[PDB]
Design a protein around this ligand. Structure first.
Ligand SMILES: Cc1cc2nc3c(=O)[nH]c(=O)nc-3n(C[C@H](O)[C@H](O)[C@H](O)COP(=O)(O)O)c2cc1C
Ligand SMILES: Cc1cc2nc3c(=O)[nH]c(=O)nc-3n(C[C@H](O)[C@H](O)[C@H](O)COP(=O)(O)O)c2cc1C
Ligand SMILES: Cc1ncc(COP(=O)(O)O)c(C=O)c1O
Ligand SMILES: Cc1ncc(COP(=O)(O)O)c(C=O)c1O
Lengths: 213, 213
């Protein structure tokens, strides 16, 4: 077989590549990723985020629901992710529907963060206009005295999302410019509907094929 | 004044930050960026690309129009860009309409690339399904003999786009977690329609304001 893969379960293939990036001393945050969202009407936006957990259920991350990305996901729950590991000449793309994580789950995660991080989430109405940087500094100092020795409650607007993967591409750059692209997508006729000459069977309902660079 | 800026023209502020990233030995490709596009119906996608020129007119890059991103830009000419410079703890976001570059302009740029790069563009119908990596290697070797000592013509489907900026955000990370976000957007009532208490005047028709992190 081999098209240079560890697993035919894309999530398990991601785990192998992720571990390698984590293993690499030249990569600062291997879980740093770019999240692409858009309005229903077709207006895209994108920003860096940190992946906070992954498994069969999907890719998890946290943000403020009232942020610009949050308003977009809530009105049009679809997203794409891009992981780029320059020292490895690798790129991973993930496409799928997104779902809000349960409250208690966000709670547990929220209180596992360092206190200063929790307090930061309470001061900032993420992406709303503010007058200046001093406004943040003042509000932050005041909330630190309010919560001295106290537990910081999670804002109602703060939480997580999990993106269930429908498409996952592994891009491996090559000096000759003929990059390797192996893309997985979930098939509809799973059970046994043999497909195209160039389409292969992956684990579960996953199908994979090579894409020209 | 100062909110830590070099220019009130966002394109000129980008130039200052870009130069710094270029100046940094820990950044491999300072012009590497993530391009976010989407279908008209609201389905986003994203991938890494290289910025190939910028100025008042916009941000320029090249790709195959028949690629997945190309079909998306052509049916819904709007995009977003994300530059992330980890060693500088900086992020730059650009939102705007996109326009295809003129043919002759793509021609000149195409022939300035190294030959192997030009030939690579002729072999690959970017993002179309292929059977395996050998298929690319064989086709590439054959096109090298066809073009030995000959000029490689630009494929009809290969070209560039320029994204004219409507929104540009400068994100500067901070250890205390109170990141600085200064976002520029072009105003409609340019000439003199004084705005919100927290909205300021930038060069030309540009307006700027701070956003909570
Ligand atoms: C490396 C990196 C990681 C980040 N991680 C997160 C994160 O997990 N959640 C978040 O809300 N913002 C995160 N941010 C900040 C976002 O890029 C963005 O400024 C913020 O979420 C507001 O985006 P929006 O205005 O599109 O909603 C991170 C920035 C960088 C540079
Ligand atoms: C750092 C980097 C730079 C890249 N630059 C470009 C580029 O300028 N143009 C391009 O077509 N693809 C470029 N690619 C490849 C794309 O990420 C992608 O594989 C290709 O354009 C097909 O994307 P699409 O299927 O969404 O259309 C680059 C990849 C990396 C990792
Ligand atoms: C498909 C593709 N086109 C273009 C580029 C870079 O542009 P250029 O070869 O003109 O420097 C890359 C870089 O990785 C690429 O993967
Ligand atoms: C606004 C924001 N939230 C969260 C994070 C990172 O997540 P966490 O603090 O839970 O590790 C970042 C990292 O830069 C961020 O900018």
């Amino acid at each position: 077989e081999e098209t240079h893969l560890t697993s035919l379960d894309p999530v398990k293939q991601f785990a192998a590549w992720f571990e390698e990036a984590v293993q690499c001393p030249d990569i600062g945050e291997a879980n740093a990723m770019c999240l692409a969202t858009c309005t229903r009407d077709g207006k895209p936006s994108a920003r860096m985020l940190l992946l906070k957990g992954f498994g069969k259920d999907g890719f998890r991350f946290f943000t403020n629901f009232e942020s610009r990305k949050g308003k977009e996901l809530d009105s049009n729950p679809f997203a794409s992710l891009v992981f780029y590991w320059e020292p490895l000449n690798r790129q991973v793309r993930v496409e799928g529907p997104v779902k809000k994580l349960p409250e208690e789950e966000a709670e547990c995660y929220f209180h596992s963060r360092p206190k200063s991080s929790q307090i930061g989430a309470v001061v900032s109405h993420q992406s709303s206009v503010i007058p200046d940087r001093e406004y943040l500094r003042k509000k932050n100092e005041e909330l630190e005295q309010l919560y001295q020795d106290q537990e910081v409650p999670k804002p109602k607007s703060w939480g997580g999302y999990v993106l269930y993967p429908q498409v996952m591409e592994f891009w491996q750059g090559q000096t000759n410019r003929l990059h390797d692209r192996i893309v997985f997508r979930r098939g509809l006729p799973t059970g046994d509907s043999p497909l195209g000459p160039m389409t292969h069977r992956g684990e579960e309902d996953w199908l994979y094929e090579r894409l020209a660079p």
